[model samples]
Target: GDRICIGYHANNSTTQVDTIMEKNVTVTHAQDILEKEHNGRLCSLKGVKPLILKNCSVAGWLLGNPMCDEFLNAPEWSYIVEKDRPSNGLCYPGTFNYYEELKHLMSSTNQFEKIQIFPRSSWSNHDASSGVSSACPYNGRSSFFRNVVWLIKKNNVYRTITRTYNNTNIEDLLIIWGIHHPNNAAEQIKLYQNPSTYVSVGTSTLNQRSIPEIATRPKVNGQSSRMEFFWTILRPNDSITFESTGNFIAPEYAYKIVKKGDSAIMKSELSYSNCDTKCQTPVGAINSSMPFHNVHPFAIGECPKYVKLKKLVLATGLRNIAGFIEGGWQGMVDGWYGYHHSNEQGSGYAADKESTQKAVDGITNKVNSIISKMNSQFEAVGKEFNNLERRIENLNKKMEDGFIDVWTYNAELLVLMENERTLDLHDSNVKNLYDKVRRQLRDNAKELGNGCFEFYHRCDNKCMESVRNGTYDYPQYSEESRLKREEIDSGL
Candidate 1:
């Protein structure tokens, strides 16, 4: 008989070995799989422990979970030791910003599981069973996003930062209240008692607070405002209920207030809130669809200039399969969980190729059609220019006959000028179409080449891989190795 056993080590906090295991491998084979999963890095289950379970039976909780329960209820920046024994031990230490990270992992896990297990019940109450507890307040707490970031007042001072954003929904309204007021959760109810200080975070910021729903205008051509004000709209709590200390509760967007001196020099999260979304490619295609509505690692819709076509293509590709996987698409993503349960191989990898390629193809086809139309528009403009040129060549008086009358000149010139204007308008339309097509090409290349191409390989077609492979990079930079202050401070 073969069994799989798991043990956690003290020094393996950052290693993501959970749910990275194969379905039915023996403890000996498990060691080899874990070895490759770590990719040369040391992990928790090492040495003697691997030998102990080399011949045991495989059963119980530690099979595979993308939105893994093994990491849930983890104590701030840490998860439990063994899969079956969650409360026994804790691995991983703490960072300054612990709760935010915890919230993010929880929210992302919940969302991924919902999309994976029961996508049709999306945004409904039935989708809460992924990993988080199913109790009502817990259920409410499991949702990934909230429309507002509520500010709390303690001892007459309003808290500046209320949520940790990860361009997705885990750090949310209900979760924040639970973390701050854990035991006295009923008291937490008072925080949202009247829903004061709610801001209408449009589709852009609705997913993550990193990007604001609005920002200072971008430098168009060569000019724009050097300074812009950001205001969080609020609703003043008037004639509302209060508990204990009676205070007027008004929902307001709190500005990023900073401590002066050396503290201000530290990395500022809110400061970058006003920074503009830059173009990745100079003279690149205009990707109007670069940012989408609050999808993790991909939800960015505020960029109005060059669209992040790669992100869009990658996201769209994933979503197409995401839909089919949530279905019974057969051996592909259709009977996904069934495939996992059986632990057999089929069209898992090929189906992934098909589903993702399907999404990319759909967009590619649309772009080609637009390109054809723009070509026609270009031909039409050429014809109009030829007519205008002929009119100009014969216009007014020639040296042999003398000048034409004003009525004839005006009559001839007026229609041609009007025609030229119409043609120019069509030309502008053509350029706009070209801009759109260019963005599409730029993004499509990412998908066909490295963007989705690389990501697609990690996954088998059955859609059993982690929602995001390994780890999503949190982009970081420092003053020692950074953009010049002058360049950052002044808008070029």
Candidate 2:
């Protein structure tokens, strides 16, 4: 009898062969179909063992192959292996080691069964039972899997089959081994799994095409790049409450704070706390709608000249201190010593002692007075330095405020001028329309002349009636009219 058989090596392992055989079919013809279907990678069935009757019975249920069930009611395996040339290589290098891994896995357990081997990649969960062939990799090598294998095991024996339907209701677990790059493996796995912090709700049918809503997870390292506002506004254990009001603008939120142990309520509003009365009031009302109407201009005044004068005074004071220390001290010592020596030359020993005593007292008093004077001078100079420093700081602040005011004034002026020009253009358009209508009315009257009684009486009466009743039909103002008005306004 003719038969069709399929066999494959386990994970490229040459120890044993797994085969499936069906009777009543030409082996050579089946070989031709398998070769064409798999792009000529079919291996010979020589030295292959036929699947056991028990294995075939389970394979029929899983692989949907009814022929395998035929052997279940029989007492024998009901298949034979024909000797032929050996297979060269069943799989390309770098492809998934599906069979080898399955064989190793089954060694630890006896309940597993080999169900199917898909030597192609598929993205759809339903593709397993669709009879889709695995696509070959380009250039004969790839780190990713070009094929997958499924195995099933019974109480002791193992069998491999070819196809099964995928059920999503079951918790399907997929194990992917031999990842070339393990650095980002966890993140890549996350792309496949549901986020750990999300809550699933409703049935899958009810929420079809719905995106998952994930909770806000705590920041990693307890740090984030977002800016925090009013961090120091509340004290520890302080509570805050918000209320919606009808008077507030759309999308605007307002809050009022009630301090602990206080009856006062703090409102959320802005105030010009930095500006006093002098700054709040404008010097002149340049434009009523502009910021200049309220902004005060700052003056530098004689600050520059005053600063230069103070600097000169400080320099001169330092020079005076230096001169007094270098010349005045030496001159006072020389004068006291010379006076004492001359007195000693003209008197006896007793007179010389009295003269030396007088000279010593005089020099001590003079030195003390001079030291006091120098201390006073130092105090004056210190005061001057402090005053100059304060003046400079104030001047810098004023300059900054002045620049801000000037910039604001100029911006407001430009906006106001643009608004005025727009209004002028609209006025010009209205005037031109009125003049055109008046000219048409005058031309009609000239054609009728004073001869036509209807024109002389009824025409005037009808015109007045139409004007008073507001029933006259006017032409629509368009882009051409706007352009004409602009040209006349610009004197072009």
Candidate 3:
């Protein structure tokens, strides 16, 4: 009784939610029937057994024996098995795969080497959900598998093949996935099952010699940081499936064994049934409620801003399309201009000291401007802190006089305190970002100055050379010119 707790957060930072399940027989005389009724549903499904490995990875069973030989190793040990319809959580869904789980399990311990998971065929109650029709309807005539069945019609997020690193161009990514139709269970099946039958709806990446050479730049232009962009689909989609069958000893305790049994057989079969109907509402079984489990508004606001990068990537293609419409007319015009333009801008090198100095000067000025703006932000946040301090002082007195309940909005003081601390932390980091960027620009300025000096004078000499051979360089006078002259004379 002492060990049993319905639930509690593991910590402040992690998202993990733990659970407890146990039964208490002590009959405290409730209204009598109510207690009995409350305990009525204290039941479990039939086919689970004891396991030594609590949270043990199932990969061990797969790699050690594809025929379920490893599971036979332990006579008394048991694992979760739901072999039937609407069965408990022990059964693997149509989309479950043990690949990643086995990957992790192997790393969890180094006791064995060279694991194998092959023939990959037999495991499931394939057609039981047919009874539920829409409750468990078939996705389509074609089947899609990613270690598990994925309904392409319903799922929006696409399997990303390749993209520019750290690009958060989410919408574009989705469009690409849609265009390629990688998860189209029907197409995916049609390709292998009957390629002759696989007619194209669009470009199929299915029977490809090579993946398309498509990658994207970052959502923000000129951004330079090692970033990996991701999204939180309000209801997240996880490609990974987790399954563990453990013994429910009492209220809060359960145990799993490391030993495997004979159930690890992989088989294949054809079924003619519908999958369960998905909810009319997202997460339909549960009611939507404002989160009590997490810090609000702020938690909601925590996501950084990013958008899909959309660009008209085929402007030239458009021109070609227009050319097609105009027959040979547009092609003739393009050819004439293309020849002339190619000759005109051939190695155009007209560098001047003024332009170079102006460019570096602007960079230095911008850095200073950003640092000033960040300091201004610091002052603004400090002002808010001061305001909160005064509000808290007033609240303390009101609480003392019992004029306002402490448990009311005033209780959010802890959150307010955390907010202040976060501001303080962020203020430092922002200032640091500014400081680092500013210093980098300063160093860049020095390099720019040095490099420009060498280029300007050399080009000035070229200007003289043009009087003799090519063209004149409109260089300027500066400290760089003098140094260049000296270096040139020394070399001579």
Candidate 4:
């Protein structure tokens, strides 16, 4: 029986990583490491129980996600950009930050189930980098990354340092909050009535707080701040980690966030989220379609560099198929599930090999779909851009025709130019997103085979042995004489 692997990506976490990594990554903290994640499916079974981590750094996650092609071709430091104007970027949250490692990890998990695990920190500030990536709130400016660091302290599950940061430059004075699991509910209400921590927004510290989300939850033991980290765009290799309050057994079809952790705490349930993707070589020919909006060990999309020529399609397909089997794709993706084969002619593209008519047809259909979608998007934008252009022209005309005084004309013209510039920026951004969408479609058909290859092989084909001339016999009538007697009795 095959197993299903489910994943959990909380908040806009992927964007968070993208924001920081785009800037710069300075190892301010003393501790830094590398690791991996998996979505669950009881296919790729392993003997050893792998170690699970609590809070981790950006570099830590890269071991599992490798962005070989993207990083190779992207603007130097595409992973990390400077904090300047005209370069605002956003990333899909919960995405794997380790471009290269994750690609390798995803490309090989067709054998067993894998799942990545992450928990919402209802305790820390939502935007805290968590050492995942310097994408969102933090711009790689802080000296150290303060995140959840889990280590044994005493016999009774104790709490230790507040900022268990891998980078050590920043200085933050924070306290820990301990809430026993069994008594959490009733205790929560009691605590809600009172408070655990407090901070000061105005003059002097006065606000009391219990849960992390509260606006003015009072705090105690005065708060400390991080120093070394800077605020900038995200950079490559920046990432974060969180501890699962559970166990991820390899064979289980489902993930159980357990009451505790162990060496193999997350196991196959250790899932990774990565937009930087790659596909393994398909079993047969190179793939010619896009692999967008699907999740598995390996699938396609988000890799904008490798698509240079049509010949590479076969290679892309094979990689999609293999990497997916190897556990190298995102666990959850959103799209309308499609059912089509590449070997059918007229289904997608007529240019594909005739033997693979279905595949060719699917490609044809995809090209059509892309053209149609683009046509519609362009039409909509054309109307908007046209109007903006006309507005600018009208403003310029007014000044040239002397319809208004110099002072009035200058103000109106400046406004129109600004509007036009803003419109162009948005238009360019749209194109980038569109490119991403196309990347997803490029090797789609073959990439999907990643998660289902084994299952289909077992289910679709049959094994049979031919019989010789005198070998035929009915199992129900083990003795041939019984059938003969029945026939005689009927005749009588």
Candidate 5:
């Protein structure tokens, strides 16, 4: 006499037996036992059928058609009956439309069991000795799903629906099959009736028990919670359920059966912890630990220095243009002033010469003073720009290193804004200073030209008066005066 012992356990605990039903049947008869005991159906599970089948050599009786076509056309080919068919072939059938009459019977009596498979109670605040906790309590009355077990049949096949708050996130029903076929009638009945009771011999923790890593990012912010269900078939050919939540590493619990001293025991391995400190790094977040400094060398120290050098080049170019303008104006004023004073001194026009020299000196001094003042202002602006740029680079480095919190980020932003305003003000000041310098130089050049013209007029009047008074007539001095006046006019 042999028996099947079905059990389940939460994190790091002894298995609790669900059932231990005795059975003595062949592999062919095992399907009927499962259908009767578990209130399951005998429908042909979809997505598990063979892609190719052999043709029938002898066609007669019920065997006249190929078994492939027979099974394909049968009503049991699907989980739902023909009367309950809908427009969408992939859509799940109505709960009451199952092909199993016993399903309707179980529904009427409300005897279908509901199981909690996610967010293990042992994950948060369980008492170590008593093995009980109220942190993640199971809500049996929740309408997330009417029944946890949807379909169960021979060969340890199952179709189940997991619960989640959001209906749209529900996973499609998947067909899971057993990996190992029992060799004898006793083991076959045990596996077919309750696969959880027939754990393979010599099973170890290292044996193909790891769950597949989830690839999608979990939604953790707004809604109640998210649940992902993964059904993995292990090496010994048994199915295990893996559950994960919004907290990426939240205590992944695997419900698996292990053989212990001739008994099959359901054991749950709590692979991780829910706490931030204790949780291991998830596979999805491993990229965060990758070396990021080498890829972006500029971000380290080079970018700011390069920017400073570029700004210096621009400042130098502008200063050179300003210097060129100042030098040209100075050369023009010097030539005209020298000629006017030398010619007037030789002609006996001392009063005219003195006044003209005074006028030229006044304009030249004003122009020189304006150029010096504006040059200093431009230097100050360049210094301020460099200082502001350095401060911005420092703030960015602090932010990247996570030293700045929300308040610090806001305060630093304000500082940057003030720096930008100061730079703009300096730009406007430079423009105005340049305009002032240009106006002063133009006015001085005009004044110097007028003074030279008046000096020439006075010299002509004196020369003409001397000639009319019958004094010595100096035609050579008049010619020299005239030639000098022409030079001054051409220079202006």
Candidate 6:
């Protein structure tokens, strides 16, 4: 049967990946599925209803009633439910609010038992895997929402929320639902749940087979895109879940059930397959194959260039960890700095330019992230050393005139003293950090002097990427020459 597919992606670029993230991968067997399954009658599932989804925004949009009378509306007719008029109809993408109306409809139809799955919550940007996203839910980050089943009764909006430990660091930007739908958690759940015996571990999501552990990432070219980061886990003997889900659909097609006698292969397609560029391993499946479905098949590669492997792991470790289904949360902090640092440096930039450009980008992209974290660390004692440099500028402006007022300076000194008391540092250490950042900025200002206005000359000018599988900027300078320069002075 034909299937329609909706896709969502992070917005770091504007290519196919971006468009799909915003709208959807596209229409697939939508009409085909109806034609074959329903013989062109009004959709038994959706056609009778006549809507895959009405207007939905990844970012929440307030809904309105078509008629002036409030009583004329219902959640189904209005994209958003307004218990109150206008403002209250909003369905936040990442929040569970969006599904209030639909969840009811699905329950009435017994879709979960019939389709075998239904949403436990609203759709997220990653659809199945988003928000505290990884399967590893420990340490208060990463979530295993993927394991929870939900199948699309109809299309709807969704959002993902990026987390932040400090307000100024790399906070997560939700990959809310695009105009995408069929490629959703509800559908994924329904596909696997046609029979319904999988015991959902904590949230009724997992199938009670071998305490099933799952890992997923986008795959491309019949290959697991994660090859650089991980190796495939496989077994030769009977590994398929032995029991039936008990809700199997006796379909018209003769597609045979996969068994140890059958081959397990990678399936990549432009529609309905979430493993588009990633690899997925269904827990307790026979021979525990390579990829999924019937499109482009691939072997899970074992040997990736170690250098490339390390880089790949470091680049997407957190995100990858965010998706691990059975617990890998501690991994998030263990290699955090290393991975985050690497992601900042994207690929293909000449060493020096890449290095410098990344720094420039990091500071710009994360100024608020940096500031918030710094404050969190220092807030109790009053702003600490997070983005110490910025704070100093605030202090410096007050000192510009002639006299360095003892009372005023003393007041500043006391605050530093209070911080020193908490961190057990000497007044001098606090003073040193304060002075260093201030001195550097001032030094730059002084050199460029008034010529480069205070705004333009602060160490690297403190400013602010299209990233796909590849990062775009290429460095023009020679790394060897820059490193070998005799004047190894600090300059941006």
- Candidate lDDT scores, in order, read 0.21, 0.22, 0.21, 0.22, 0.23, 0.21
Better of 2 and 4 by TM-score: 2
TM-score of each: 0.13, 0.17, 0.13, 0.16, 0.17, 0.12
- For model 4, where is the 10-residue window of minimal lDDT? 246-255
**For residues 1-492, what per-residue lDDT tens digits would candidate 3 score against the true structure?**
000000100111211111122112111011110000011111111223222232222322321111122333324421121111211211212111223333333222212211111112221312211111121212432221111122121122222112111212221111111111122334433322221121111222222121111233342212211111111111112121111111000001001222222221111111112222111111111111211111111111111111111110100011111111121112222111110011111222222222224433543454344223322111000001124367765664554334223222222332234223322332343233223322322311122221111132332233322322223223343454567556656786
Among all windows of 10 consecutive residues in model 5, the one with the lowest summed lDDT is 28-37
Clashes of 2: 11
lDDT for each residue of candidate 5 in 19-56, tens digit (9 for 90 to 100):
11311111100000000011111112222111111232
Backbone clashes in candidate 4 total 154
- Tens digits of per-residue lDDT, candidate 2, 323-433, equal 111211121221111111112112101111223345345434543442233221110000011243687656656665555555444333333343233223323432333
What 10-residue stretch in candidate 1 is worst by lDDT? 28-37
lDDT (Cα, tens digit) per residue for candidate 6, span 1-492? 111111111222212101111222221011110000101111111111211122322112211111112212222210111111222211211122233333332222211111112233432322332322232233445432222222222224322222111111121111111111112344434434222222111111112221111234343322121110000111222111112221111111011111111112111111121122112111111122211122111212110100101000001111111111222223222111111111222221111232223433543443334223322111000111124366664564444321223322332333233222322221222223223323333322222221111212111211102111122222322243244332334544
- Which runs in model 1 stand beyond 4 Å of their true positions? 1-237, 245-492
Q: Any idea what lDDT model 1 has?
A: 0.21
In model 2, how large is the Cα lDDT of residue 189? 26
Q: Write the per-residue lDDT of candidate 4 for residues 1-492, one digit (tens) a residue.
A: 211111111122221101111211111111110111222222111222112121332222222111111112111111111111212221112212223332232222212211222232322322222223232223433222122221221222222212211212121111111211112333322322222322111112222221222222222112121111101111122222222121100010111111121111121223222222222111111122332111221212121112112111110011110112242222222311111112212121111121223433443454344323322111000001133367765655554334223322333333234333322332343233223322332321112333321111111111100011112223322343345445545786
Model 2 gets an lDDT of 0.22
Give candidate 1's TM-score: 0.13
lDDT of 2 at 84: 22
Cα-based lDDT at residue 352, candidate 4? 12
